[PDB]
Amino acid sequence: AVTPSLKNFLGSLIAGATVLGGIALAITAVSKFDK
Amino acid sequence: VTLALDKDDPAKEDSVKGLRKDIN
Amino acid sequence: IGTYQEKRTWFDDADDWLRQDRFVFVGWSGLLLFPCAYFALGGWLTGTTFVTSWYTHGLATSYLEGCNFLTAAVSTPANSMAHSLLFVWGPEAQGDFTRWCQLGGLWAFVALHGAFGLIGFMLRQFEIARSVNLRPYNAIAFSAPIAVFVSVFLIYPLGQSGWFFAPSFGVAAIFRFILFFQGFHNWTLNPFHMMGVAGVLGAALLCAIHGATVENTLFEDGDGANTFRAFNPTQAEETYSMVTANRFWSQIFGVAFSNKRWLHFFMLLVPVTGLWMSAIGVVGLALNLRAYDFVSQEIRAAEDPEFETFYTKNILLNEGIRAWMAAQDQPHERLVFPEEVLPRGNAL
Amino acid sequence: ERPFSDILTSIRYWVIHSITVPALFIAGWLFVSTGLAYDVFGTPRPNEYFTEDRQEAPLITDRFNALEQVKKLSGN
Amino acid sequence: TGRIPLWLVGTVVGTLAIGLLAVFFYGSYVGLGSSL
Amino acid sequence: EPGLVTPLGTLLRPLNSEAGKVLPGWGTTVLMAVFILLFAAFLLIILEIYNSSLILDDVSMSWETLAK
Amino acid sequence: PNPNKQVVELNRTSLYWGLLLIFVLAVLFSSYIFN
Amino acid sequence: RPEWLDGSLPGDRGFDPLGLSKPSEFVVIGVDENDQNAAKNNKGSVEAIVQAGLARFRECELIHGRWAMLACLGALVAEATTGVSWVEAGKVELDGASYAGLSLPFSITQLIWIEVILVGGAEFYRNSETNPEKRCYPGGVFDPLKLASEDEERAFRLKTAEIKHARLAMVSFFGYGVQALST
Amino acid sequence: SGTFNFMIVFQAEHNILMHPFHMLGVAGVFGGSLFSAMHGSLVTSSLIRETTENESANE
Amino acid sequence: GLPWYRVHTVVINDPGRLISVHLMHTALVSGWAGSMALFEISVFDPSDPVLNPMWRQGMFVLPFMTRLGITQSWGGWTISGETATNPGIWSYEGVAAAHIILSGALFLASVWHWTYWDLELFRDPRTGKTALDLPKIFGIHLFLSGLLCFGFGAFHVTGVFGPGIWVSDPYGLTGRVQPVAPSWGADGFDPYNPGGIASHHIAAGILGVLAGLFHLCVRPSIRLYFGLSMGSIETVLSSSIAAVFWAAFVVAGTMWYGSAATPIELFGPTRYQWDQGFFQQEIQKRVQASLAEGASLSDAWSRIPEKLAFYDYIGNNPAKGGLFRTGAMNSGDGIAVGWLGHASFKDQEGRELFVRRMPTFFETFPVLLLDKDGIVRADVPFRKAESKYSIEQVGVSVTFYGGELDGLTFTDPATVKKYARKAQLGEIFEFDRSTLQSDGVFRSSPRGWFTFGHVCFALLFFFGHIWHGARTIFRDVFAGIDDDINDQVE
Amino acid sequence: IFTVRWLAIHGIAVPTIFFLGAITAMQFIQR
Ligand code: CLA
Ligand code: CLA
Numbered sequence A: 001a002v003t004p005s006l007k008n009f010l011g012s013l014i015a016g017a018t019v020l021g022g023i024a025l026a027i028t029a030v031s032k033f034d035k
Numbered sequence B: 001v002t003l004a005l006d007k008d009d010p011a012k013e014d015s016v017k018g019l020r021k022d023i024n
Numbered sequence C: 001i002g003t004y005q006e007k008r009t010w011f012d013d014a015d016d017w018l019r020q021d022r023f024v025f026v027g028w029s030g031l032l033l034f035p036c037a038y039f040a041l042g043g044w045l046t047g048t049t050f051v052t053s054w055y056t057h058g059l060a061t062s063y064l065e066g067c068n069f070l071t072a073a074v075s076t077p078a079n080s081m082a083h084s085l086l087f088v089w090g091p092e093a094q095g096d097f098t099r100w101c102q103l104g105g106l107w108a109f110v111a112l113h114g115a116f117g118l119i120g121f122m123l124r125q126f127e128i129a130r131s132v133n134l135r136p137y138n139a140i141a142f143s144a145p146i147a148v149f150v151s152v153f154l155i156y157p158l159g160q161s162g163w164f165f166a167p168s169f170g171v172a173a174i175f176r177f178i179l180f181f182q183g184f185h186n187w188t189l190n191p192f193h194m195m196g197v198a199g200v201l202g203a204a205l206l207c208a209i210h211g212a213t214v215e216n217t218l219f220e221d222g223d224g225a226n227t228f229r230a231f232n233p234t235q236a237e238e239t240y241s242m243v244t245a246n247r248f249w250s251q252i253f254g255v256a257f258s259n260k261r262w263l264h265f266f267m268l269l270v271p272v273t274g275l276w277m278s279a280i281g282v283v284g285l286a287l288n289l290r291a292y293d294f295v296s297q298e299i300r301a302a303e304d305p306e307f308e309t310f311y312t313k314n315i316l317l318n319e320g321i322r323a324w325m326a327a328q329d330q331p332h333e334r335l336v337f338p339e340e341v342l343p344r345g346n347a348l
Numbered sequence D: 001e002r003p004f005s006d007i008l009t010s011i012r013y014w015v016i017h018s019i020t021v022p023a024l025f026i027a028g029w030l031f032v033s034t035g036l037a038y039d040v041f042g043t044p045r046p047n048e049y050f051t052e053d054r055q056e057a058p059l060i061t062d063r064f065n066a067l068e069q070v071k072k073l074s075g076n
Numbered sequence E: 001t002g003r004i005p006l007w008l009v010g011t012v013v014g015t016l017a018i019g020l021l022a023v024f025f026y027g028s029y030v031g032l033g034s035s036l
Numbered sequence F: 001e002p003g004l005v006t007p008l009g010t011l012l013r014p015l016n017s018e019a020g021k022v023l024p025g026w027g028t029t030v031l032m033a034v035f036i037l038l039f040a041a042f043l044l045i046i047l048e049i050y051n052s053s054l055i056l057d058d059v060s061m062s063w064e065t066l067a068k
Numbered sequence G: 001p002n003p004n005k006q007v008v009e010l011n012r013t014s015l016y017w018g019l020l021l022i023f024v025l026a027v028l029f030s031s032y033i034f035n
Numbered sequence H: 001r002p003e004w005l006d007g008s009l010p011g012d013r014g015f016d017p018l019g020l021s022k023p024s025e026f027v028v029i030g031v032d033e034n035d036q037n038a039a040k041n042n043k044g045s046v047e048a049i050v051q052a053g054l055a056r057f058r059e060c061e062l063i064h065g066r067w068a069m070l071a072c073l074g075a076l077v078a079e080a081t082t083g084v085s086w087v088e089a090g091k092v093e094l095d096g097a098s099y100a101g102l103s104l105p106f107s108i109t110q111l112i113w114i115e116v117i118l119v120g121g122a123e124f125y126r127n128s129e130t131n132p133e134k135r136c137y138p139g140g141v142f143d144p145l146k147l148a149s150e151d152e153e154r155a156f157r158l159k160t161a162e163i164k165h166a167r168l169a170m171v172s173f174f175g176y177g178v179q180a181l182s183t
Numbered sequence I: 001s002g003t004f005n006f007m008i009v010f011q012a013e014h015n016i017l018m019h020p021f022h023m024l025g026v027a028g029v030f031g032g033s034l035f036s037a038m039h040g041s042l043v044t045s046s047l048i049r050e051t052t053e054n055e056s057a058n059e
Numbered sequence J: 001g002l003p004w005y006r007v008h009t010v011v012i013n014d015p016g017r018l019i020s021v022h023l024m025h026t027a028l029v030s031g032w033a034g035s036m037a038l039f040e041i042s043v044f045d046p047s048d049p050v051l052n053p054m055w056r057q058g059m060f061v062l063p064f065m066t067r068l069g070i071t072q073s074w075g076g077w078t079i080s081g082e083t084a085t086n087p088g089i090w091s092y093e094g095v096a097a098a099h100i101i102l103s104g105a106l107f108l109a110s111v112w113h114w115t116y117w118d119l120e121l122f123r124d125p126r127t128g129k130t131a132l133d134l135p136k137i138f139g140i141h142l143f144l145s146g147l148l149c150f151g152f153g154a155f156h157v158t159g160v161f162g163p164g165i166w167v168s169d170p171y172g173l174t175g176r177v178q179p180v181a182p183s184w185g186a187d188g189f190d191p192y193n194p195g196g197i198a199s200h201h202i203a204a205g206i207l208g209v210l211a212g213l214f215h216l217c218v219r220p221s222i223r224l225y226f227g228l229s230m231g232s233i234e235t236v237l238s239s240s241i242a243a244v245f246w247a248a249f250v251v252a253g254t255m256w257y258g259s260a261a262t263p264i265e266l267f268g269p270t271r272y273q274w275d276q277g278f279f280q281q282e283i284q285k286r287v288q289a290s291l292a293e294g295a296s297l298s299d300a301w302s303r304i305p306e307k308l309a310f311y312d313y314i315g316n317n318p319a320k321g322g323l324f325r326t327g328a329m330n331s332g333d334g335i336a337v338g339w340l341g342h343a344s345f346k347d348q349e350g351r352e353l354f355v356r357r358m359p360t361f362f363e364t365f366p367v368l369l370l371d372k373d374g375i376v377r378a379d380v381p382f383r384k385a386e387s388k389y390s391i392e393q394v395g396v397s398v399t400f401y402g403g404e405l406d407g408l409t410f411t412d413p414a415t416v417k418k419y420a421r422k423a424q425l426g427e428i429f430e431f432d433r434s435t436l437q438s439d440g441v442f443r444s445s446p447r448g449w450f451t452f453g454h455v456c457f458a459l460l461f462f463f464g465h466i467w468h469g470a471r472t473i474f475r476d477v478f479a480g481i482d483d484d485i486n487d488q489v490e
Numbered sequence K: 001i002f003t004v005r006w007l008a009i010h011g012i013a014v015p016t017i018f019f020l021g022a023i024t025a026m027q028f029i030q031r
């Protein structure tokens, strides 16, 4: 089955996407409308 | 007389028997 | 662009904003440097200020405990965590931040973000040198601080029994790691540290000589006694007499540089060759492949009770470091030494 | 524009940074003096190092069960 | 720009930086980490 | 000046033929980045099993795997 | 008739660095090699 | 729906989720200079845009499916007549050579030499042709009943009959591949 | 090795590592090795193209 | 002309001399492999595989032949401890000869490609200059790589056609070369499962074939042609040096930590097995399995294999060595002859005592004798002027069980101190310092020497990745910078 | 003003004054 160690790990790759995406989302937001 | 746990505690104490389940 | 004129995608709109000549250069590497290097510095300044080491080490290491700048540190995890990465979502910490700090996981926060910070800073100076169209020698020199950092903070504890024997991030905490390597590894005797000293302490010589040889062979290009005013960085001529500098050292020291380009590369070469050799010695100490003993002088000093060298004095001093710190340096061993079994000279 | 010496000599800089800067110093003063720094980071107070169970240094000694063990070492 | 003199800023800010540092040496002899 | 023609050289000749020829634009770069990040995710699987940082109930993760 | 023909050069200052380097390494390491 | 297909072809449908047979443009980059005797070596430049294999891809489905139709029709009846699984052939033929219960005299070492001469040389002769419609659809002895007099370039589909049966035979042998080791 | 004995005994009797003037001396030789590599590489990375790739740039 | 450190860059422009110069390196590597295997066979002592195995004798490449099935020799002997009735052609000496015969064949091929460098294959059509199609060249070699990977995994390892790999028990006692079955669940990523090795090379071999078919057909992007500098033979060098230090950290990492691809009967135990009490716990697990069923002490300690007690010894720990303590592990403490028993310590109050073992850090370590509950009761003190834990006053006797000193007791306070200082080193063994004239201080195993080379190589190849990645991105400014380059400031 | 130069200094300066308020209150924690 799925262990809690795998639950927190797959939750980290979701959280690692919301961090790495949001850093990428912030540099494609300032690139377009210049704030 | 001696468990295998408290024979590897006074001899090595880094033992994988002595380190796991050591919340007791 | 590209001398075939395609239409710009969102990459080109992102590449020119990152590679912008603003006040602080971000670049593509700054998506790796500035989040990681701010959290290594932010993790170190938080851990030295607030985070305890009472559970991982049994000793206080923060300003809130009573430590000052010299004795506060971000200390390594316990030897019971082995090489665990101690993610805050890890199996040890499990989401709780206030126990992740108590478990020494904030050490590996600083060590990993510092390691990817050094990758971000070394890629920064490939990226700037390609913008400025220079040669990439500033990055190649920074391979040697990355050779030192990876071999000591990462490669060394991976060969030992855990992240415990890593250096903690502090002043007095580095100092015991230094005294750990004398007592246990005899690391002064290791010939890779000897090439590391001769590189580090020989680059300090080259820094002081080249600075003083330039500053004392300057051309009189001004009238006043401030010689720093008589320079414009858009001048085409040398600001100091290389020919006078050569004749000076060829008569003082007998051997001088005659090539200005070889000089500045030799200033590049000595600290980098010195640190890469010393990094190999710490790789050797990760496996405890020490240069501890000269066996031909241990066989002689055990078969001759009057043969004393400064070497055998050093071996006795390391026995003193090993037995007197390891009841407190390695608390995971839980070794108690009765005071009559520790080595001891006369009347001390 | 604004090269680091028309900012520090401007009075509008100091009508901001004589209000936000002391209120941030006091915010750091009150983060520790209200004892909240001992709670967020789990550093023990000077009356919290030694419970009645142990009178020695703690030792974590267990990898995967360290989370509830450090709760027992701290005395919670 | 030039509403306050830069040398009077650098004197005053430098003074309570030396003044804050003297608190760090005062607190090194009393309270936590005073060895008493 | 022509090179040296060999029987194996002409059997292998169309393999060293289209040197310098590329797709315009980005091509399969976005396809590559999906495969890099899956392999980055795959290398985080095997790094943490061998570190005992992601725990699977099926593995033993010890020398006791050699028993069963 | 290879067009890729180059020559190696080694001036005397590089001779003196090279001979020094392999004697200083022999001064250093042979104490460990003879053990 | 794709546009680079659907004409003079049996499977006139745009199934492609990704366009593997898409004729793509190409641009030729120049060769970078690597001469040391020059002071500066440049990274090359864009030289030649080139306007631009559906014929190659048609041949390669036809070969795979026809080997699959020899495989699917050959594994069901050797399981029926002999009474051995299709995966088990080779384990039981190394011990005793047979065909439909009839013992064969060949050592297993000879089968490597027989197959790489016979099947190998026939594979060396198939690619000895330089006409892609003749490569897909040859004439001669392989058409003894004269399909080639019958046309299919119009709505007649006298060629579009092996191609559907080649497709699911690859799939049913792919279904044999997901059944052999696992189940 | 006699130097090494002199250092080890010095740190036991005088605690040289915790002395600020030794801390400044380490900052002088770590800074002096940083600045030797820093000034040494910026000059090397700014050399005017005078030679080819078949001969050293020191020519 | 060129400097001394730049001489090999005459090969960067012509691909025919690049074949010839990699062929000469390949002739030297396999020429080393056969020559080192001939040297190791000529000095290997196959007499005692139980108590003088290959990792004890300094054999470095002989555990790599034995890892992939080669267990027999042309001298009759095997590794498992029996006579080879048919050694075959793939002996140790057959493989040591097969690398030397290959070394001369690769030598002659390099002489051919050096003279016949100007092949028409290396000149691309319609420009006529020497060029290499590095995206397709990679697609060829990745296709061959996954074809060998799948071939090694489905046939050699799985035992379908090849022999198999080495598989042992958890405790290094019963180990052979036998075929493995691939394991496709989550269990295949446990690196102590040998089934995950076969399941790797099938799955990575199939994907490497499918990836190879991609890079044969699909040309790269133009934006990714310039950004990775694909038209240079050095941007493949930088990325390959990046590939081989990554691999050398993984390879030296699994050698040091232990894996199913690094058995302990071939490479010796790991340092984490001494530290974590791996064999000590099992030795106690088997004594308590016999004292619970009803048996004596000396009849239970005799049932432990002499090979299992040899793993429980600090001299076979790979981290008890030295950088210039050169040679075999037998050159340090001697060739092990026989297990000398199990030292059990009792004092005058009839209480058992347990020697605190030497941790792996300690060159020297004080001997301490702790009770059941972990409290020090006896030691060999440094100051003997007013002692309170001396062996003489506490009355420590030592009895052995099993081994060469079975049922024998020592009460002499000089004798007890000798065996107390041997019991902190592990199980008690009898050596001979006369057969090889042993020094007296331990060495490291080949598990430690392999790890030392392959992290020092993986770290020096990080710098070579840094150098050769910099020479591709900064290829245009290698000989210096332009004269008008002052536009980069404000 | 939220620019890159503003986020560079106030990434450093804002926690620096927060910790300097914290460290100053630690000098007067007696026990
Ligand atoms: C086909 C011919 C052949 C064969 C059968 C062998 C067989 C053997 N060799 Mg020899 N050898 C050969 C050619 C051959 N060799 C040549 C040409 C050379 C010169 C390069 C050598 C040099 C050599 C040395 C130096 C040594 C051997 C050794 C050995 C033995 C163990 C091999 C081993 O463990 O390697 C392990 C092999 C690997 C771990 C492979 C590493 C490849 C990495 C993992 C792949 C990474 C790149 C890949 C492309 C990534 C993409 C994968 C996928 C996506 C496609 C074995 C008897 C060893 C021995 O005991 O000999 C005395 C030994 O030390 N060989
Ligand atoms: C279901 C199929 C299957 C199965 C069962 C396996 C099974 C396995 N694979 Mg394979 N694999 C497969 C499919 C499969 N693979 C496929 C399809 C691919 C794509 C081609 C791969 C690609 C692949 C790679 C590339 C690797 C494996 C590895 C492994 C092993 C993982 C356990 C291990 O040894 O960890 C040990 C390995 C790790 C923990 C890897 C972590 C990598 C670290 C971070 C590298 C550190 C170096 C780096 C520069 C850090 C700096 C230095 C540091 C000191 C600071 C195991 C044998 C690994 C292996 O062979 O190990 C021996 C490995 O490296 N696999």
Ligand code: CLA
Pocket: G025, G026, G029, G030, G033, J032, J036, J039, J040, J043, J057, J058, J059, J060, J323, J324, J325, J326, J327, J328, J445, J446, J449, J450, J451, J453, J454
């Ligand atoms: C990665 C490569 C590698 C590895 C791990 C090993 C590992 C091993 N070898 Mg093998 N060997 C190798 C490559 C390798 N070998 C090669 C390339 C050769 C051909 C020369 C040999 C030839 C060889 C022989 C002939 C013997 C071994 C032996 C050994 C064992 C003892 C190790 C030892 O004494 O180290 C010694 C390590 C050092 C001295 C530290 C080296 C540190 C650097 C390199 C020193 C250089 C500094 C300086 C510039 C040198 C100048 C000093 C001058 C006075 C010489 C060990 C199992 C011995 C053995 O046990 O066989 C049974 C043995 O007799 N090896």
Ligand code: CLA
Pocket: J004, J005, J006, J007, J008, J009, J237, J241, J460, J461, J462, J463, J464, J465, J467, J468, J471
């Ligand atoms: C796959 C590995 C590989 C390959 C093919 C190359 C290839 C090249 N390198 Mg690179 N390099 C590498 C790894 C590699 N290097 C590594 C790991 C480092 C870090 C140390 C470097 C650092 C480096 C620098 C700093 C320079 C090169 C240069 C060169 C070029 C000329 C080399 C030459 O003339 O040497 C000539 C060497 C000699 C005449 C004698 C060298 C003797 C030393 C002491 C080694 C002793 C040999 C030993 C027996 C072999 C053991 C090696 C070990 C790995 C097994 C050539 C393109 C040069 C270049 O780019 O020119 C423009 C250059 O300046 N390389």
Ligand code: CLA
Pocket: C032, C085, C116, C118, C119, C122, C123, C126, C146, J228, J229, J235, J238, J239, J242, J243, J245, J246, J465, J466, J468, J469, J470, J472, J473
């Ligand atoms: C200090 C480290 C360092 C530096 C400065 C460089 C520098 C360079 N590399 Mg190298 N490289 C490195 C490490 C480094 N590399 C490592 C460790 C690997 C893996 C073996 C590679 C593999 C590699 C390849 C295969 C290639 C390069 C290339 C390049 C060049 C282009 C820039 C680039 O793409 O960077 C590479 C980018 C990075 C290093 C940044 C990635 C960092 C990510 C974001 C971190 C992800 C880790 C994850 C979040 C942490 C979880 C794991 C944790 C638990 C440990 C440049 C010369 C290319 C080249 O030479 O082109 C000409 C090329 O083809 N590099």
Ligand SMILES: CCCCCCCCCCCCCCCC(=O)OC[C@H](COP(=O)(O)OC[C@@H](O)CO)OC(=O)CCCCCCCCCCCCCCC
Pocket: C252, C253, C254, C255, C256, C257, C258, C259, C260, C262, C263, G011, G012, G013, G014, G016, G017, G020, G024, I058, I059
């Ligand atoms: C009155 C006092 C007497 C003089 C003091 C003692 C003099 C010692 C001089 C040693 C010179 C060695 C130069 C070798 C190599 C050599 O000939 O260098 C020559 C070199 C000349 O460089 P150029 O720039 O002229 O080279 C041009 C070429 O690179 C091509 O452009 O001079 C230097 O590099 C200066 C650095 C000297 C660094 C001195 C090294 C330190 C001492 C060496 C270790 C000694 C160990 C002793 C152990 C017992």
Ligand SMILES: CC1=C(/C=C/C(C)=C/C=C/C(C)=C/C=C/C=C(C)/C=C/C=C(C)/C=C/C2=C(C)CCCC2(C)C)C(C)(C)CCC1
Pocket: J027, J028, J029, J031, J032, J035, J100, J101, J103, J104, J105, J107
């Ligand atoms: C002709 C011929 C032949 C022969 C062949 C031969 C005889 C070969 C040999 C070969 C060989 C015999 C080879 C060898 C090699 C070796 C090597 C190659 C080595 C190297 C070394 C090294 C590399 C080292 C390194 C190092 C050092 C320096 C020190 C330590 C560390 C290290 C390791 C790093 C015959 C008759 C068969 C027939 C065919 C042809």
Ligand SMILES: CC1=C(\C=C/C(C)=C/C=C/C(C)=C/C=C/C=C(C)/C=C/C=C(C)/C=C/C2=C(C)CCCC2(C)C)C(C)(C)CCC1
Pocket: C038, C039, C041, C042, C043, C044, C045, C046, C109, E017, E018, E020, E021, K011, K012, K015, K016, K019, K020
């Ligand atoms: C950690 C962490 C975190 C958080 C937070 C952070 C990151 C923070 C940062 C913070 C910071 C970043 C801080 C800083 C600080 C600073 C300081 C604390 C400083 C101090 C200084 C001083 C004390 C000085 C003094 C002096 C001198 C010596 C010189 C000048 C003058 C004077 C006297 C003033 C996160 C979430 C990410 C995650 C988890 C972990």
